[PDB]
Design a protein around this ligand. Structure first.
Ligand SMILES: CCCCCCCCCCCCCCCCCC(=O)OC[C@H](COP(=O)([O-])OCC(O)COP(=O)([O-])OC[C@@H](COC(=O)CCCCCCCCCCCCCCCCC)OC(=O)CCCCCCCCCCCCCCCCC)OC(=O)CCCCCCCCCCCCCCCCC
Ligand SMILES: CCCCCCCC/C=C/CCCCCCCC(=O)OC[C@H](COP(=O)(O)OCCN)OC(=O)CCCCCCC/C=C/CCCCCCCC
Ligand SMILES: CCCCCCCC/C=C/CCCCCCCC(=O)OC[C@H](COP(=O)(O)OCCN)OC(=O)CCCCCCC/C=C/CCCCCCCC
Lengths: 269, 246, 269, 269, 269, 269, 246
């Protein structure tokens, strides 16, 4: 196919220095994209999570209603609004009648806060970790493409026709290999650096998200259905007991009242 | 019914890049590097004698080019009639060296050019480059293939003998501005004789010329001492045996 | 073995330009299949999820029967009909007595909407992510096969007998491997592009599916079992109190009728 | 050392054609084992899942009993008998007394059907996915072993020690490298083929298992505990009301009886 | 500095054959450790699981107390004692009053058996799969280290100071490369074999563990809470009518009593 | 290009030996960081978990309040205090009346201990496993970079001007390759050593954390909700029987009072 | 609590292997093999170039030595006075080639030897080795360093001219013995050369000698028609220039 022959002849003639330049520019663009879309956003998320955790720990000793108001005001303005709404919907408010009004005396947790402030929604989707965990491999592939191409250019240009041309051919081949190795070096160093930065940032993100969800989970205690069932069982037991006692008391009252009626009838007679 | 809402969990823990593949890429890169550098070392070693010979040849070429440039600059500074062709190590006197039919003489321009170029070549040879790479000066004679071979060759040899005489004849202007050591050097560095046939020029009159062609030592010769000989000091002035009045 | 040499002559008899074209055509077919069956499908899924979330957020303030009917009509002619049917079967409707009839005043959620509009059913199964996440590896493998085949073509025709034959054989081998690496570089570029597109699409699909399920979850409140248990405990306490008060009232009234009967019979006497 | 030298002599003395032949034979055997134990097995599983789903959808409008015996006959004589027994043990039968006997009027689901017809038990364990997901890596590793061992063989042949026989050594080295790369290319080809087939099969198996599970889920409705709790709450409210009303009615009856007794006493007087 | 040169002189002073010997010995020791701590252990686990499953299937038709005591004896002189204790603690015993004493009539399961006889506790932790799934990488790394060391030795020996010594130097370097590649290939072959055995053992262990947990799950039925709620609803519905009937019968009996008293009073008067 | 030449001359301006010294120093620093932040931390975690398990096993035969106090003091001043607080919030204490006041007779678990003493919170976060599991790849990549950078230095300084300059450049290139071999061997050795230690530590940590959570789960039994429902059902049946018995006893006793009143009236008359 | 313990599990998907380090390692294996093949092939090729050049030069030298050997054997067969030196590619006259003062002609034995050696040179140039490497024949004149330099130079030139006349004189037996083609070959081969004064050991009888030496091409030289000067066919006899009474 003549088109393939034309492409081959037109890319044998590419200047060898243009391949490391292309690799370096593309890898630099990928690294800048990594910094903008992953590292800065991860730092921002970590700082926000730490601020949230400090805010939650400041109402550990507050009343349930003021705690709810504080958390609503904390989360209603930020991206963690629907997660907070779901978490609050999962909460159970216990009411006790005080001074003729029903007031929330305790709030109970029916599900862990991590089921609403999930690692996915709060970290993975915002940071595109699913993709950025492949970025070091992308950089490695760019490096191998550039390196293999540069070494191929050097090898095509290497042809000592006589023993007297060996020196210049060796020099040109070494220059070409230098270009290819520069491209490969930058690409692989960028890959390693991106791996280091992204793994450290994702570890910190997960740690501080766990701290945040643990702070949320410590506000409200679970197991409200178990205590409701225990109260029901107790109330049933004293319900049988009180039924028996009420029957006995009614019998005693009826006996006494009938004796009084008999005495009154005797007095009248 | 009474299922636990607070269950044991496990996140999306992605496993790292398999160590074998990065290690094997490292090993293959190392092997490719090894074979490249071994090829470079082997090719340099097998051709190091060729490289040394080529470097020596290039150095000799540079030295010869420098000597030719110096001699050409001296000729330009002193006598414009002297033109030197550095491509093939030739000294030409075309206009002043034109030879008429059946004659071995030249105009005063050729005599002035020769007696002016001889000291320049002597001082060039006295230099280190001349003392290391300059051999004796070969005299060139050109003849045509037409006519009688014997008569044309006799004309050429008469021309050469006349040139040698004019170089080393008594009463010559060259001998007035010469010393004994310079005369001995001229006698040593000049040999007479040589005929040739060429068809690289379109004019038969072009072959009626004399040109100075110097030759240089080879790399493997390197100025063998036993080749040289000696001459006794000049005792009587040289007299030409050719027919000056004709 | 004669069979090995026979297949090595058949495979290395292919024109060297046919390795890059085969690799490029195969990788392009894989890429077109990826675009058609994964990328466009993911875009349609994301668009539909956005439209559904817009529709659900418009019936936030509606009456529970009205919004139930709206959601019903929203999904029957849709691909999410089965998921909506399961979700609606999981809903708990609370009836109250108004005007001598039991009408729905509130619809509750017994299970989260994500349990039915799951990531699997709505994204992974439609997009065949169990397969397409391995496509970059397949493209890379095909590129590697192309390079190895070009290398084998170059090696099988190498003639080192004479220096001129050595030079021509080196030239031919480098040319064949260069064709092959054209194919392989195309494969690696396509693998990088497929990786980026696939990860981004899966990210956005999960993000907007989460938004959709959060919109659905906000319509119906969970935790109705805990409310029922709390009501049962409160009713048990109030019923014990009512039993005691009713016994006391019965005793007082019986005293009253006995006194009235005594007075009446005294008057008759 | 004599031991290592003898080992090297034994390894490098084999005919160089036996390396690609062994690699190809072992990879072909692994591929045939994959076809027999994974691909055909997955096809049979998918076909059975389709048949079961078609059978389940046929009783979508049947009576709860008729559905129950139909599903018993469909499953208890197959490989899903244990899964069906577990799922049925999870089913809750709601009884109603009609015509003097207790009959099932409705069957409720307490757990999702995917809990018992799980992806593991129905797909991953029969297909041995814990082993076959690693098979492409094993095939590629075998190709790499062939590459290494063929390179050793070729480098062993390269010891001319005479310019006359240098060309023969180069020919042998080229042939041995050709063999090694034949084996490696075949291994990579079969690796990507196995990857393609296994991922497509696992994706289709998950798709149709999800359809089967959805078909089972649609038969029975969940949330029976919530409606039981609602019935209990409603009954407690009506119980308090009926208790006070029966107290009032008892008071009225006692009053009427005492007035009648007074009237009879007046008649006697 | 000179420290680097000194440690290079020390490192490359060893004979080339000692490197493949060391690699082979270390890789063989690691393989033997794999066989001892992993493969035989997994075989023993599989045999034990099959024996336990056979034992459990024998008591399928036994009385609940007989089954419970048999399972206690089965898993008390065993490594599964903690899992069995947890699973038995998760079992609900239904007592009924027979012959004046509370006797177990049915045992109900509240959690799946695999929740306590999990894959981690019975397979992953005993086999240390968190370590042994990375052993092949360690083996390959050891082989690559040996190859690098042998390449160091061979390159150090390479010094063609004379054009006539080039062929001998190249041949010796190729021999050293052969030794290094021998070490690498042995390590890679052992890694592939370990991967094969490990993955097959994991697949078999998971299969037979699932069979064991399915045998345990089939003994006891779930959903006891739903039938408890159904019984509660039935009891409340019956108790409303029972209270009404008791009140009516009490009123009727009191009417008959007062009529008899009035007749006796008439006779007495 | 001028920019490329300037970058090359700056990067290559390093003395060839500082590239092996850098990889070695960087790899050793990474190994020391691994030892300090992972291995010593993991050893302390394992030792603490074993001591905690011993303490828990020592308290298994004590009273519920004594066990609670011992576990409170055990974890309150440690890094497991949040996990213990969550676990205790998940605990359900059963109160009974013994000598006038409420006394805890039993404590019940509503969730497994591993829900709060999770592998994440107790091992993966404190050990930064999400980062350190990628360290060996970083080390190997750092070896590859060092190889590339040393070869870049060697190739950029090749001087073909003079034959002895050629010899010096060749020796420098050979020394650079030896340096690259040494650095790669060191990096891979450290990477596999880190892998071995990391995976051994993580396996031991998981094993002993599982032992710790199994020890905690042994103290308290689950399934208290089913017990409460069974008690409620039994109470409902016995309450129906008791209401009928109370009505019968009441009507019989008032029959006794009415007969006694009639007899007394007859005697009085 | 209100959830179910019999819930769905395994909600995790298997990760795909990273394919890019695999591509790096495999492409680097291919490039490593490329470099190994290029290393071995280039080493073999360069060594073969060097050995081929060395053996070509050796074969040329052996053929030249064989040509000198056969020429010397033929010369000994014809006349025993001819001295052939293959160690410098020169043929000299032992005793017949000596000259006295004011002498420009060889003796009768010298003339006979000069006439006899020419057909041997024609046979040498007619051989395959002659067709491959044979070059022109320069004639060097030698005279004692004592006396007048110009007198010695003119006498040597006269001797060389007389020798070439005896080669190509119509009255000489060579003209009536050789043919036109042989005459053209002689014209191509024999030519006039330089004059030397290599006098040593105070041997005036031996120093004043003239001999012909054989040069050859270069191994890197190229044969072309430009250097192949072809003389016109003989249309007239040639008469020598210097006359007997001189
Ligand atoms: C020396 C010779 C050789 C040199 C080469 C070195 C080669 C090494 C390569 C591999 C290294 C392996 C081990 C790394 C350690 C990580 C492990 C770990 O968990 O850390 C322990 C520890 C955190 O563990 P923890 O138990 O979670 O917390 C306890 C804390 O100690 C204290 O408690 P706390 O956490 O509550 O404290 C409050 C918190 C409050 O902070 C927060 O709330 C924020 C949370 C973190 C944000 C997200 C992190 C994202 C990553 C960095 C982002 C931008 C950095 C850009 C620059 C770096 C790359 C050049 O502050 C922090 O501690 C967070 C910041 C530090 C933690 C990160 C560890 C290292 C970060 C280094 C990056 C910056 C270096 C600047 C210049 C580097 C020049 C090479 O971190 C430290 O305290 C620092 C010691 C570790 C230093 C080693 C790293 C040095 C640089 C390595 C070279 C990088 C690439 C090579 C150079 C190429 C470019 C030319
Ligand atoms: C899809 C998996 C991998 C992705 C891409 C594969 C990369 C490698 C590509 C392989 C190149 C395939 C080229 C074949 C296309 C059409 C063949 C054709 O018509 O070419 C004619 C050509 C030249 O004509 P002749 O006159 O016979 O030759 C001169 C002297 N005998 O002859 C032949 O090709 C004959 C042989 C037929 C095809 C041979 C190759 C078979 C296919 C293999 C490739 C597919 C998988 C690779 C496996 C690798 C190791 C087995
Ligand atoms: C440390 C990064 C982590 C990863 C490391 C692993 C790879 C190892 C390879 C890198 C080795 C780096 C060389 C060591 C640094 C030495 C630089 C220094 O201080 O020298 C100053 C130096 C010249 O001094 P000398 O000539 O050596 O001393 C005087 C005697 N004539 O002056 C300079 O300005 C040159 C600076 C060049 C080095 C700068 C950094 C080089 C690269 C950085 C890290 C490596 C990754 C990059 C890969 C290649 C990217 C294209």
């Amino acid at each position: 196919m003549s088109w393939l022959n034309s492409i081959l002849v037109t890319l044998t003639s590419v200047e060898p220095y243009k391949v490391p330049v292309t690799v370096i520019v593309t890898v630099t663009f990928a690294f800048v994209c990594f910094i903008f879309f992953y590292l800065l956003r991860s730092i921002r998320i970590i700082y926000g999570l730490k601020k949230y955790t400090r805010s939650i720990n400041s109402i550990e000793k507050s009343a349930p209603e003021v705690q709810l108001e504080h958390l609503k005001s904390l989360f209603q303005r930020s991206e963690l609004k629907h997660a907070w709404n779901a978490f609050e919907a999962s909460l159970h408010s216990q009411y006790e009648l005080e001074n003729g009004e029903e007031k929330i005396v305790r709030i109970r947790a029916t599900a862990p806060s991590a089921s609403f402030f999930s690692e996915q929604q709060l970290v993975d989707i915002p940071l595109n970790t699913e993709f950025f965990k492949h970025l070091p491999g992308i950089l490695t592939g760019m490096g191998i493409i550039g390196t293999f191409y540069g070494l191929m250019i050097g090898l095509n240009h290497f042809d000592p026709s006589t023993p007297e041309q060996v020196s210049s051919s060796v020099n040109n081949l070494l220059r070409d290999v230098l270009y290819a190795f520069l491209g490969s070096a930058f690409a692989i160093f960028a890959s390693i650096l991106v791996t280091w930065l992204e793994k450290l940032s994702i570890a910190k993100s997960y740690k501080y998200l766990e701290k945040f969800t643990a702070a949320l989970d410590s506000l409200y205690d679970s197991g409200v259905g178990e205590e409701y069932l225990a109260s029901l069982v107790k109330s049933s037991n004293e319900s049988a007991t009180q039924a028996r006692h009420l029957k006995e008391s009614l019998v005693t009252d009826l006996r006494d009242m009938l004796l009084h009626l008999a005495e009154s009838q005797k007095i009248e007679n | 019914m009474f299922g636990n809402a607070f269950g044991v969990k496990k996140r999306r823990s992605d496993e790292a890049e398999k160590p074998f593949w990065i290690s094997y890429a490292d090993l293959m890169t190392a092997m490719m590097v090894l074979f490249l550098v071994v090829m470079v070392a082997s090719l340099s070693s097998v051709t190091q004698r060729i490289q040394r010979a080529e470097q020596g040849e290039k150095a000799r070429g540079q030295d010869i080019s420098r000597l030719c440039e110096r001699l050409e600059l001296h000729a330009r500074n002193v006598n414009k009639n002297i033109v030197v062709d550095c491509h093939d190590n030739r000294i030409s006197f075309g206009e002043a060296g034109r030879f008429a039919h059946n004659q071995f003489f030249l105009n005063a321009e050729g005599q002035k050019a020769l007696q002016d170029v001889v000291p320049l070549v002597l001082e060039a040879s006295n230099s280190e480059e001349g003392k290391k790479w300059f051999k004796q000066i070969v005299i060139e004679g050109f003849t045509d293939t037409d006519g009688s071979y014997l008569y044309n060759l006799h004309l050429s040899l008469q021309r050469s003998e006349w040139v040698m005489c004019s170089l080393l004849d008594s009463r010559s202007p060259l001998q007035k501005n010469i010393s004994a050591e310079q005369q001995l050097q001229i006698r040593k560095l000049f040999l007479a004789g040589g005929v040739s046939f060429n068809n690289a020029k379109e004019s038969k009159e072009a072959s009626r010329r004399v040109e100075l062609r110097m030759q240089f030592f080879g790399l493997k010769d390197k100025r063998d001492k036993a080749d040289e000989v000696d001459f006794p000091p000049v005792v009587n002035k040289e007299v030409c045996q050719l027919v000056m009045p004709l």
